[PDB]
Structure 1
């Protein structure tokens, strides 16, 4: 029968009540390293045709992601285009947006990331609205991935934000058609786990339920976007192992501008086609005059690290006799790392490699596995 004011004061300052912290950090670090133990050389389709389906409906007007959903999805898609064409140069990409119940194609499937960047910049200014259509987007992705050759893997990335979708027709027929066309769909949901997206990811990825990814915050969204630049591991049942006829053009040098064969504009430089001697603007592109894939050796060179990955470096035992006092490829001295008073050399920062048995620091552990992709100890080994 009383009131809120007549109750006793909250005393919030009294509620605040006040070394083994390194161990508490290193157990989480080891759990993070535990999830990276399953490193295997799965065969991955290097040549990809990724259709990026972006939601541009009324669900993007929600400001639960700063500043609104649509603006940062466009920015993260720009960063994803840059990273995808950096790590998968040969792969082509097309961008499709969903708006007002109609799937809209904004850039054709092309190997030039600049066109997709310009298209995303053009979409960034308009306000998203409408009611999304997963079936229209999937049908247009099916139409765009139809002329993709059999060696090139057909993939669809959907940044889906709404929780419900409206389809002009049956969506299970579209799912069956996508399965029959060997199209793998990975959906990055925004709000919650939609059942149709989970079923689509499960059916299109041969019973794999791990291709439906839902973010948690900003950092999880960035990690999920950076997870999609890696080529997907193909199935054993796929038997489309075909030789790809392609040429390596020589970079022509000329001070006189000449007409390119791809855009019919005056270009100083270029690359003369090794088969039909028609110059192109940028690489890697198909030849506009003889329909041959024209790439460089560096474009192939970017993708062996997916074909064979580095085995993850093993944390050294604390009681094990350390070989060196400093790093191998880095020569940073390993400190005492006394986590507590009697910790002594607990969780020593050396990272032994499984082949050369060479010790590396944390910076070398996160550099040799990420930016480099080769162990300097394994190459210094005189086999």
Structure 2
């Protein structure tokens, strides 16, 4: 039963994974990461303290966010002494934000938190953002109280008017205003206010925010965005970069004004045209054609082959059949491959091999 207990839990874990529909997701994002640095963040419930762990996971989130959302941008704000302090402008450079977070890691948190000040600052940072982007604010909250100079309800109404979306990660318990902010802003959904229960669950919560948010059916901002695919040049003598005005050896040439840029993806400093590589778009294709989940095969029927289709690992004999099949191609897969086929790879090897 103990081994069966593992099986049934595995089936229950798979139950959630069974439902996968090709939701429309906003690939081009514009995130504002708000961190809480107040007296309440000096506690020791998270080792060594709340401030240290939050900053560390923020750096990891920055790495993951820009890895899977290459054509997005991020800005970082913190709450200190009842004021909102800006530490990073909206930009597509993942290194600027990590450097800012590392600097923040030293100073001791103190004072009171102010959601209204942070929300107002985030509202202003997302003003010069195109209409095709998804304006999002991810607040990491640790306090149980808010000291604001004005009416927070008016700010919430303004946020809803500007089509900004708020996700809040609380530390100890539910705050009434945070629930309202995450609900009135997400079209009534109450799943965007998450309260962790341990260190491990926090890492999952940060990891979940990396993926793009599905869009609402009545919020239509469909448009064609003018992009550019520059050609990398290899030069013999250094040349000035049009973005930082410093000598670098080689850089991509924009096809609209021929000015060179150090790194991609960025908006060209001259023609204001986004420069990206084809790979940066290919990094998001798995969010538009998600691979349909694999369902275990009951032992009543007869199996096809003794070994895995893609990895040639013989299935153990053991109660519970250790086989998962792809309905599209009907090829059995080992339990190990299916995790790697749906998290690292995003194409079923069986489907590709089949000719049409």
Q: Which TM-score band (shorter chain)? A: over 0.9
Q: Secondary structure at the match of 2:121?
A: helix
TM-score, normalised relative to structure 2 = 0.99
CA distance in 1, matches of 2:161, 2:289: 30
Render the CA deviation track for 1:6-43: whole Å, top value 9, x for unaligned.
Answer: xxxxxxxxxxxxxx211101111111111112200000
Deviation at 1:223, TM superposition (A): 0.5
Render the CA deviation track for 1:72-91: whole Å, top value 9, x for unaligned.
Answer: 10010000000000000100
CA distance in 2, matches of 1:185, 1:157: 6
Deviation at 1:282, TM superposition (A): 1.1
Deviation at 1:191, TM superposition (A): 1.0
Deviation at 1:346, TM superposition (A): 2.1
Deviation at 1:171, TM superposition (A): 0.5
Other-structure match for 1:354: 327
Deviation at 1:97, TM superposition (A): 0.5
Render the CA deviation track for 1:227-261: whole Å, top value 9, x for unaligned.
Answer: 00000000000110010001011111113111100
Render the CA deviation track for 1:126-173: whole Å, top value 9, x for unaligned.
Answer: 111110000000000000000110001100000111111111100011
Deviation at 1:124, TM superposition (A): 0.3
Larger CA Rg, structure 1 vs 2: 1
Deviation at 1:380, TM superposition (A): 0.9
Other-structure match for 1:116: 97
Q: Secondary structure at the match of 1:125?
A: coil
Deviation at 1:214, TM superposition (A): 1.2
Q: Secondary structure at the match of 1:39?
A: coil
CA distance in 2, matches of 1:59, 1:90: 35
Other-structure match for 1:339: none
Other-structure match for 1:237: 218
Deviation at 1:355, TM superposition (A): 0.4
Gaps of 5+ in 1: 1-19, 337-344
Q: Secondary structure at the match of 2:350?
A: helix
Deviation at 1:44, TM superposition (A): 0.3
CA distance in 1, matches of 2:191, 2:19: 15
CA distance in 1, matches of 2:54, 2:64: 15
CA distance in 1, matches of 2:231, 2:99: 28
- Segments ≥4 residues shifted beyond 4 Å: none
1:364 aligns with 2:337: yes
TM-score, normalised relative to structure 1 = 0.92
CA distance in 1, matches of 2:327, 2:176: 43
CA distance in 1, matches of 2:177, 2:234: 54
CA distance in 1, matches of 2:250, 2:186: 43
1:329 aligns with 2:302: no
| Two-structure CA RMSD over aligned residues (Å) | 0.8
Render the CA deviation track for 1:89-117: whole Å, top value 9, x for unaligned.
Answer: 10000000000000000010000000000
Deviation at 1:320, TM superposition (A): 1.6
Q: Secondary structure at the match of 2:78?
A: strand
CA distance in 2, matches of 1:254, 1:320: 64
CA distance in 1, matches of 2:336, 2:235: 44
Equivalences for residues 281-360 of structure 1 within 5 A: 281-336=262-317, 346-360=319-333
Gaps of 5+ in 2: none
